[PDB]
Write an enzyme that holds these catalytic residues in place. Sequence first.
Site, PDB file in Angstrom:
ATOM      1  N   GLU A  25      45.503 -49.505  15.290  1.00 32.97           N
ATOM      2  CA  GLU A  25      45.038 -48.207  15.783  1.00 32.97           C
ATOM      3  C   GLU A  25      44.973 -47.122  14.698  1.00 32.97           C
ATOM      4  O   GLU A  25      44.038 -46.327  14.656  1.00 32.97           O
ATOM      5  CB  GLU A  25      45.886 -47.730  16.955  1.00 32.97           C
ATOM      6  CG  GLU A  25      45.740 -48.559  18.257  1.00 32.97           C
ATOM      7  CD  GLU A  25      44.348 -48.475  18.919  1.00 32.97           C
ATOM      8  OE1 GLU A  25      43.535 -47.600  18.523  1.00 32.97           O
ATOM      9  OE2 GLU A  25      44.100 -49.264  19.872  1.00 32.97           O
ATOM     10  N   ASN A  69      35.545 -39.111  19.768  1.00 34.92           N
ATOM     11  CA  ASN A  69      34.514 -39.953  20.336  1.00 34.92           C
ATOM     12  C   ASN A  69      33.384 -39.087  20.848  1.00 34.92           C
ATOM     13  O   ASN A  69      33.389 -38.649  21.997  1.00 34.92           O
ATOM     14  CB  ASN A  69      35.106 -40.765  21.487  1.00 34.92           C
ATOM     15  CG  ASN A  69      36.251 -41.644  21.020  1.00 34.92           C
ATOM     16  OD1 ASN A  69      36.067 -42.436  20.085  1.00 34.92           O
ATOM     17  ND2 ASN A  69      37.459 -41.440  21.577  1.00 34.92           N
ATOM     18  N   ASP A 120      31.786 -39.593  24.512  1.00 37.63           N
ATOM     19  CA  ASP A 120      32.313 -39.147  25.795  1.00 37.63           C
ATOM     20  C   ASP A 120      33.194 -37.926  25.692  1.00 37.63           C
ATOM     21  O   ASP A 120      33.839 -37.553  26.657  1.00 37.63           O
ATOM     22  CB  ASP A 120      33.029 -40.292  26.524  1.00 37.63           C
ATOM     23  CG  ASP A 120      34.411 -40.540  26.006  1.00 37.63           C
ATOM     24  OD1 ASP A 120      34.724 -40.107  24.877  1.00 37.63           O
ATOM     25  OD2 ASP A 120      35.203 -41.138  26.759  1.00 37.63           O
ATOM     26  N   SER A 153      35.975 -37.237  24.311  1.00 37.94           N
ATOM     27  CA  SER A 153      37.407 -37.414  24.245  1.00 37.94           C
ATOM     28  C   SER A 153      37.834 -37.576  22.789  1.00 37.94           C
ATOM     29  O   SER A 153      37.009 -37.832  21.920  1.00 37.94           O
ATOM     30  CB  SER A 153      37.801 -38.664  25.047  1.00 37.94           C
ATOM     31  OG  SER A 153      37.364 -39.866  24.417  1.00 37.94           O
ATOM     32  N   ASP A 171      41.136 -39.513  20.366  1.00 38.59           N
ATOM     33  CA  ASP A 171      42.313 -40.381  20.309  1.00 38.59           C
ATOM     34  C   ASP A 171      43.339 -39.804  19.325  1.00 38.59           C
ATOM     35  O   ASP A 171      42.999 -39.462  18.190  1.00 38.59           O
ATOM     36  CB  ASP A 171      41.925 -41.800  19.876  1.00 38.59           C
ATOM     37  CG  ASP A 171      40.815 -42.403  20.729  1.00 38.59           C
ATOM     38  OD1 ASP A 171      40.875 -42.324  21.966  1.00 38.59           O
ATOM     39  OD2 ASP A 171      39.940 -43.057  20.149  1.00 38.59           O
ATOM     40  N   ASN A 174      44.249 -41.735  24.278  1.00 33.23           N
ATOM     41  CA  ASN A 174      42.997 -41.042  24.562  1.00 33.23           C
ATOM     42  C   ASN A 174      43.199 -39.888  25.506  1.00 33.23           C
ATOM     43  O   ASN A 174      43.979 -39.964  26.451  1.00 33.23           O
ATOM     44  CB  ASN A 174      41.945 -42.007  25.113  1.00 33.23           C
ATOM     45  CG  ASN A 174      40.586 -41.340  25.303  1.00 33.23           C
ATOM     46  OD1 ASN A 174      40.265 -40.864  26.387  1.00 33.23           O
ATOM     47  ND2 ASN A 174      39.788 -41.307  24.249  1.00 33.23           N
TER      48      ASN A 174
END
Length: 130
Positions: free
Chosen positions: A35, A46, A49, A51, A53, A60
Amino acid sequence: KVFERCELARTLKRLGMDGYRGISLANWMCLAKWESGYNTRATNYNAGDRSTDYGIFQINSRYWCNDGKTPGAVNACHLSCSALLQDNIADAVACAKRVVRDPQGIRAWVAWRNRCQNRDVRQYVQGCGV
Ligand SMILES: [Cl-]
Ligand SMILES: [Cl-]
Ligand SMILES: [Cl-]
């Protein structure tokens, strides 16, 4: 901060992650490695969408933490996403535990399916005293 491998392993063990809902420490290590490369300050937007992380497990914003800026988002870990950018990973660990209380478990992270599932992940904890 960027953790060293074995220091992280011991840190996660102290925080109760070893075997948490059936998930071995080595699985959590492999997740963190893929990750974030063990970096607590890692962030990834991102564009798709809206969002983001956050942190060492790349949790998220749509489901798990609040950053104020992700539409329709909920905050199941009941934390500011800022809490997932600390050097101390306790909050991130509590949020990761919460993620895996849901049906998918660790499968909620696609990186885990790609890089960890069905693999030999022993190397991640070799020599760490865990
Ligand atoms: Cl396993
Ligand atoms: Cl918070
Ligand atoms: Cl901190």
